[PDB]
Amino acid sequence: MAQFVYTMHRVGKVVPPKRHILKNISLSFFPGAKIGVLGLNGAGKSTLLRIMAGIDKDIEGEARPQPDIKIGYLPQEPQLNPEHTVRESIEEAVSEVVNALKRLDEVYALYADPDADFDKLAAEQGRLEEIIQAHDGHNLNVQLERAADALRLPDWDAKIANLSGGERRRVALCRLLLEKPDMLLLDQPTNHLDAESVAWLERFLHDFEGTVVAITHDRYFLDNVAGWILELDRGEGIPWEGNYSSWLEQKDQRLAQEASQEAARRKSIEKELEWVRQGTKGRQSKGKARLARFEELNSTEYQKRNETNELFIPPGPRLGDKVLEVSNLRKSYGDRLLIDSLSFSIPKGAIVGIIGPNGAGKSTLFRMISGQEQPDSGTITLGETVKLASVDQFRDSMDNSKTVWEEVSGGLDIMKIGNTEMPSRAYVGRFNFKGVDQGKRVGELSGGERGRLHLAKLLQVGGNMLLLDQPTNDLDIETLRALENALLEFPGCAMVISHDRWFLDRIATHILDYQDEGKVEFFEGNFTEYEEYKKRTLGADALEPKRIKYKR
């Protein structure tokens, strides 16, 4: 509290044209502080974290850490090379000690042979001693084993490309945490993680010693890990002390006050306009000073914007009473099997929430359902009146080299969505992408806008069978409620995979819960009465965690 671990004095940032993502930000973070970073999508939280981590440099103002603290930055989406396995990916982050052991082999060669035995070896071994002493050195195997067991990492020899999403994010988290930092900046740490891993992560962060700055959209995780909240409304960060519940009321009151002040400013502007339009009435003044003071009163106002509250899911073709029936489904990859002895039939106008632990067959189910894999048993019969639209976890297919118009529309001013046709500009603007925004490069974009454009790109086939694979990844709560509304008037059928119990509680009509040993429970109803069914077939047990450690 006496000193600070990071400081920023009047840090501004300008994007193309003239928009101030950040301006006049003067904040200092003390050691032992945990800070949440709330705000709308597009506010600039990721930009601020990049500036804090040092990758972003072209700014205005001062930004400074203390002169030796170790910084660990986790971005919006990590980049991994698919060729590596888990062991190779981890050894890429602990390469230096492995290199030191290889140099031990080299030195043992030079010392077993009388050439270069002492003349060019003693001064060279300074680093060889230093790396092994500073790090764990020969303790690397056991420390890595303990870390993998504590994170529940996948097997050491699994290909990254064949790894799932949650496992991929866990591998990225391990690579981050091996290089023990003191400053810890995380951009949506709980993105593809399940409840168990989220609980472990929040407990670890609460028990942490250094300082943490986390971009969050989960109120519960924020309230369980953070001490205070940065806001970043529009170029202005508002450090608020307290919890989420009070900050919500503070934000609503602030918005109401700004609305009132804007209305008063409009009143004054129109009154002074009605004065300006008057005459002179003789050889009198008309008041050049008043004229200048009126012209100064056009300081412009930034509309809150983003604030998505409506989404467009196009209508599909008329759907019959045989939608999807699977009978005796079975799948395995080698010895480990995902699904076995699974069967169900889906009626009309249903939303099916699919839940389970990380890496359990949820995405493989969709790959089967839409012609991409092959079950070990078979008999996944679709209907004859079914048109399928799919949305997957990773936004990798599209290229980061096209504007939003050229990507979604394909360069055509008319867009025939299913049956009818709509102008491409209007269709893309229905997803909160106005005329100015329709020129932005996809690589020059935010995470939430990336997800929105993914949805708008793949929902244009007009089919009445939605297969959504975690579409609530990096969407703010306003767009989340927009999707919650838009998913209820859509007359077709939807199957949504999501780890957000609160999101699925609103819209789920059927449940697909995964369990151990390849059990895929099918239940009819929402979570509220699913809990009652469980309490009818009740089993009581509360010993959930282990919560061990990372290192000794």
């Binding site: 043992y108 001693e129 500073a134």
Partner: protein, 220 residues
């Protein structure tokens, strides 16, 4: 009991000098043991930085008071030299693995000037315990018979802690205080010669003089 007595007997809130309490420490012969010396050294220096780690050896006129055993686990004639000049046991390169697995104990590190078919276990077997002969510290040298000085000088491994703490023996208290002085000067000389380039504040912070069950009086 007498531990509670020495609690009040030592008042380390007050600063002494380099030899102001040697008599008061010799007054701690009441404890039933041979009461070896385990002086502790703390400096003003960072130790997390990788480059500032210190490792080496030194000598003292009276010896450490312990029998340093540096077995000749080498090839050639270093084992023969040690067998008459201070070799705990002779181990050929075709038997070093067995000689380590069975009885690898030794007061000092192993000896291998040129017969170095393996550094030892490749996995901290020969380097984890600190048995790797590092010429940069002083373990390696071109003198075959010079390894006798390892047992004839009480050369000590300059182990480094995560907070730069050095614990070393000074020729157990059987040697008089006027003999402890000529070891104190030597250890300070070696400590200055082991100074890192990156320094700040005061180059030495605090030294604690004590015995095994004794109390740590400040040096200042």
């Amino acid at each position: 009991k007498r531990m509670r007595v020495i609690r009040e007997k030592v008042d380390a809130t007050k600063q002494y000098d380099i030899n102001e309490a040697i008599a008061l420490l010799k007054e701690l012969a009441t404890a039933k043991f041979v009461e070896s010396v385990d002086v502790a050294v703390n400096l003003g220096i960072d130790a997390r930085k990788s480059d500032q780690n210190v490792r080496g050896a030194t000598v003292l006129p009276h010896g450490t008071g312990r029998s340093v055993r540096v077995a000749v686990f080498t090839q050639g004639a270093n084992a023969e030299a040690a067998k008459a000049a201070g070799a705990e046991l002779v181990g050929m390169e075709d038997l070093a693995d067995q000689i380590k697995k069975g009885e690898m104990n030794f007061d000092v590190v192993i000896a291998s000037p040129d017969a170095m078919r393996v550094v030892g276990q490749l996995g901290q077997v020969l380097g984890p315990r600190g048995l790797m002969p590092n010429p940069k510290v002083g373990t390696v040298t071109p003198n075959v018979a010079e390894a006798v000085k390892n047992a004839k000088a009480g050369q000590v491994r300059y182990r480094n802690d995560k907070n730069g703490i050095i614990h070393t023996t000074i020729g157990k208290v059987d040697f008089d205080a006027d003999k402890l002085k000529e070891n104190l000067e030597a250890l300070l000389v070696a400590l200055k010669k082991a100074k890192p380039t990156q320094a700040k504040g005061v180059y030495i912070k605090k030294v604690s003089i004590s015995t095994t069950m004794g109390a740590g009086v400040a040096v200042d």
